[PDB]
Design a protein around this nucleic acid. Sequence first.
RNA 1: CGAGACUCUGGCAUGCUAACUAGUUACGCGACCCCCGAGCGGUCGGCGUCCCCCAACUUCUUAGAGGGACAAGUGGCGUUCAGCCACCCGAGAUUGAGCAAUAACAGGUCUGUGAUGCCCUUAGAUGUCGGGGCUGCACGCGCGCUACACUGACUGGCUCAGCGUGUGCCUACCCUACGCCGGCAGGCGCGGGUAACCCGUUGAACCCCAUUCGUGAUGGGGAUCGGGGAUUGCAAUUAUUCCCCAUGAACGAGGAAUUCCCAGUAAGUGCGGGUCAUAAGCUUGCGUUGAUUAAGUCCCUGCCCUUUGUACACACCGCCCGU
Lengths: 63, 64, 137, 70, 89, 57, 52, 75, 141, 191
Amino acid sequence: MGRVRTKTVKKAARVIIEKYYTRLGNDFHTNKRVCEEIAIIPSKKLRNKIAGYVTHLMKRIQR
Amino acid sequence: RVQPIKLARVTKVLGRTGSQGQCTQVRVEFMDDTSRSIIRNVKGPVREGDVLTLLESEREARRL
Amino acid sequence: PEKFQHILRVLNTNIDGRRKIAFAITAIKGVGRRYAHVVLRKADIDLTKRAGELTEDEVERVITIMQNPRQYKIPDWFLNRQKDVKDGKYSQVLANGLDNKLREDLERLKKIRAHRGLRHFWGLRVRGQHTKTTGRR
Amino acid sequence: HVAQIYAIRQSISKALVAYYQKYVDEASKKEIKDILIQYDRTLLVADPRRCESKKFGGPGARARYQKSYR
Amino acid sequence: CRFYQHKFPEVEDVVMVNVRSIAEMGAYVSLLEYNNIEGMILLSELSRRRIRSINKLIRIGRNECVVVIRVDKEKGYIDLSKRRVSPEE
Amino acid sequence: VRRACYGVLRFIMESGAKGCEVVVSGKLRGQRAKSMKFVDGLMIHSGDPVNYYVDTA
Amino acid sequence: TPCGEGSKTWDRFQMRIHKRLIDLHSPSEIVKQITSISIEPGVEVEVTIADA
Amino acid sequence: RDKLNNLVLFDKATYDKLCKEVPNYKLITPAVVSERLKIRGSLARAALQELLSKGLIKLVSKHRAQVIYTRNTKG
Amino acid sequence: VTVKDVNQQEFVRALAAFLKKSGKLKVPEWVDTVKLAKHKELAPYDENWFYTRAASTARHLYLRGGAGVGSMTKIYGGRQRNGVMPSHFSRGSKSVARRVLQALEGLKMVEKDQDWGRKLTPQGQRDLDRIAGQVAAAKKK
Amino acid sequence: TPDIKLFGKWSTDDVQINDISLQDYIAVKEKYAKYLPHSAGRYAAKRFRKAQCPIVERLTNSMMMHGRNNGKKLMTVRIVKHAFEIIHLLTGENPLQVLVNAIINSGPREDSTRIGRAGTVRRQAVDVSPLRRVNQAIWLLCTGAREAAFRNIKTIAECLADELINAAKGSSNSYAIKKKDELERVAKSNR
RNA sequence: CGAGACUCUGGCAUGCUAACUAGUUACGCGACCCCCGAGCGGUCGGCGUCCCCCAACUUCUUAGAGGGACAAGUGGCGUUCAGCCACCCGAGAUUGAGCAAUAACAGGUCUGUGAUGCCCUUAGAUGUCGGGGCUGCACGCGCGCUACACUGACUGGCUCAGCGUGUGCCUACCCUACGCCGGCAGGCGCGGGUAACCCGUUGAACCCCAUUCGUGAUGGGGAUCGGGGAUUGCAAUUAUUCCCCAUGAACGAGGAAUUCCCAGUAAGUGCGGGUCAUAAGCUUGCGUUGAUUAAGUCCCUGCCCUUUGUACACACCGCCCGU
């Protein structure tokens, strides 16, 4: 039901995935920290949604 | 007129009909017969695999 | 399982089992629930019993204490009329005699033409509180 | 009175387990955790539910004043 | 009591029911034909037409001609219709 | 009215602004009320950041 | 609402005042001196002779 | 609604009736005894309290609001 | 033990009877016609309750570091009927509560001590424990 | 205690479900035995959750209704425990077995749901879920006990005990039975 | 652009850093010391006060920085996408507020405004004091409150809280522990506290318990009235209010109709603050006791999606005809 992802999250995710492919893992916790290093994101909830979607993408991508 | 009481067990909750959406279609395996499997409407909330005690297959209970 | 004692008089009413003694008495005016309860305590009578129980003796002992309240240490504050307006004492008023005094006081303040008197006579509400959409249906 | 009853029950069972977990042995504490958790009563996990805030325009939190209509 | 030898009505027996009070489904009426035995009228069948009227100055103390559908001697419930009526006028 | 609004609006924007809006409200031309919005740039009204980001007078 | 017709709408403002104390023990003036300097606006700081 | 009263005098006959009806009961409360006789409810209660010093009735509750008596051990 | 370990209802009743044996409770010239608290719609059933209250007060003081009239008044207090307005908490009679504190002091069940108001006397501490023992054997509920 | 978890002075053993269609919404030992009913005081948290709640706990909850009596569980637990004792004197047995029988006999089979048919008063004969049959039964029985108590000497405990026993084996002095016979009769009829 | 996002609050951190206007632990524990129990007893356990440390801690209490939720892991489903369903951990993709666009409205306000246009009045005031009314009731309406009882009326007793607040203030001023007296209202003496120090270990009400009463307008209910005491004010008459006694109503479940509600929610129940010389049946928050029930859908209703029709366009509460 609720809290489907917004455009702001998905755009950032595409960005990150393309330019940091080798660095990125598939684990939420480590990716969350990588997003702190490679970007300035002004909220933790936003950063979590970004990180989260980026793991989901990496899983699909590695097929 | 009269028929014997048939126990019939919920196989599949078909979905919801009713004008207000408060009638649920159900398909009940006739239990005595595996050949029969007939659609009866249940008023209540239905959880699959629970058992109805049909007093009729007359006056078929159907969408509205 | 004792009948036997029954039919007692307090003032002008027949008092029989129905309720606890105290409550049973309050058929008459000028005796509320609290009044009859405290009279019985003074008169050394168990008030949990019925009024179809207890003999004539106990009744008379109650009547004497109610109608001489000060002389049996029922204090002045406890009285329905304190200092009164007719009588320079402090009187407990009972039975039909309360109705008398109520009439007296209403007539009294119609003569004297005091606000309480006039309002009551005319049927207007004596208290200053709203009667705007109340005091009827 | 009821709030406290539920709280105490949670603390005593947790207490026993806590003591055995650092000092005695794991098998004892684990056995207790098994027995409790199955029928369940939330004695090793916290209850989330605390009072919901009241918002104006009603006499209650979600209760609201009667409206009137011609 | 009642004048009749039997204590209960039977299927399709024309009776007279005193409408005591209206509540929920219709009314818990008393059959006056057989003592003061309890029965009920509406929910499903009683009405023959709808015109959005059934009283105005028809107050209380009144009474309906009804016919017995289902009678339960043991349970003390009598399902009654007025819609069945035609020779039972 | 329009000249005054345009000059001030243009000057404030030129100073450096993400955006700005000037509203003139009240009556004009006798007995009818009017409002006009003279806006340029970006403006928000969303949540708590509006209080922080935008200054009003 | 000024002039109350419509609906019952209430506004509640809060203001959250924060207090803290710190008890230093060491000699007389050099305490209150070294502390109270190097600050001017917008946070009250009180140095009290209280406590023996 | 309703109007129902009971005798509020403690009587002869109803006490005797009680004790000699005793195999009927296995459940005894004030209300039951009151209904089955014409004894008050209050003086239902009290009659039981007397009765319990025969011990044809045995306490199995002692609650403030109302009490529950058994007849003998269990009937 | 503390008094809390044993049956509280039985404790106050046992202590109240022990007070009766002592033969004094320095009783008021009121409590035979009183309003009592304003939470009451009927005058007291008996004049017995003064002993029970005294026992209760003694127990309450035993718990605390010292207390006076205020503590007793809230415990005995309840809901006050305001007529046709909403029922609300209040504190009732203070003359009786004060009198009970004075009377217990006279017997030396409680005495003035630090933290204001009366705190338990070792004489009272001994008395309370003896009835506590009787209660302890009797039940626990 | 861990071998079998009893009720607070009665047994949970020897409680039999006398119907095969009402199973898995009647329980008292099929995991759900308790000395004292209380889960966490929510039962509306999930739609799943209702299955967790046994018939005994549901009966205590449904009882507290009508404004003054609302939200007083402690009063109801005391009344209910007393009620079980009253049942036990009156029939021997186990009071929980009496309760189970009462539910089964009071629960309807067919009922009716509204269906359009010319704007005339007709309805469609439908069977109802066993969850609904249990829910409605418990409602009927609690409402029956309360209704009797209101202007009669007997207390809620006594009237509840009387209501269960009459329903357990029919007597036609139980409200729940009388209502059920009306619902099933009407169902059979209709269009 | 709105909303989302965002922010604030509620919940999960025996991890992090702290605490003598805060507590807890933990000795050594001794004393008041009771034996209540064990031990012969010293001693041990114990509600509180008192012993206190160069004790220890942040668990409860406090508030700072940190992490935790992202549908993350796993399994089904789906354009294998966006997303959906279940499952684990568990605060679950289940909290509540704050937040408002484009544009409309002759919504309300000149009596909030020494904001303001024009008009009136202005020394003879519509600029200030003395007095009365807003509080008058054959009747219509609305929000409420109190009720219709036994989960209660009554008499004893048990017993657990939270959000907040206070005097020494720029036109007027506190909360009261504690002593005494009085049934009560109230009177009177102290002392502390701009305060997590003192009120207030907030030991509140619901609740729990042993009775009495016994479903009976009964003692449910407290209307109306009569007599008296006090409190507030210089002034209470038209009860300002409070208390004491008596007098002891309708109402025993509410028609035509109609509101609100999905979880610490409905309902029951008290408390603190605001108005304030005095005066709450009000409202704003707060904790307590705590359900039954959808668990969905568009039927009615409202709002918002395409399409279609329109003699409508101040827009159907519109228009529009004949006698």
